[PDB]
Design a protein around this ligand. Structure first.
Ligand SMILES: *[C@@H]1O[C@H](CO[C@@H]2O[C@@H](C)[C@@H](O)[C@@H](O)[C@@H]2O)[C@@H](O)[C@H](O)[C@H]1NC(C)=O
Lengths: 50, 49
């Protein structure tokens, strides 16, 4: 797992490997097409709130 | 150095001690400390040692 916030910080399996400044937006791309959905780049993504 | 009394210098935690192997397992977390703040057991990434 990888999680990021509006502040831009990232946790690697909830660890916080590297620190960044404020990130406004992100564009992501991988094998996710619809067919490889079971074996896609990620598994589940959600808009989470504190 | 392993299983000997040596001068450890680890992630900004330094000192003298004897290291020992353990076979625990956790998919996350790399270091584990004591109530006082000293670190006893830990794992390394690439091998889970
Ligand atoms: C370490 O391994 C244990 C398995 O049995 C042990 O295997 C080796 C390491 C010898 O110590 C032998 O005498 C034992 O039979 C696990 O039960 C134990 O949980 C492991 N240690 C940790 C921290 O998980």
């Amino acid at each position: 797992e990888i999680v990021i916030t509006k502040y831009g910080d990232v946790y690697v399996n909830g660890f916080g490997y590297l620190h960044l400044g404020l990130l406004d937006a992100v564009t992501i791309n991988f094998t996710g097409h619809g067919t490889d959905d079971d074996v896609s780049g990620f598994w589940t993504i959600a808009s989470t709130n504190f | 150095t392993l299983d000997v009394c040596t001068k450890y210098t680890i992630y900004g935690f330094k000192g003298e001690g004897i290291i020992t192997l353990t076979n625990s397992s956790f998919l996350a977390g790399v270091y584990y400390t004591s109530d006082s703040g000293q670190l006893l057991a830990f794992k390394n990434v690439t091998s889970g040692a």
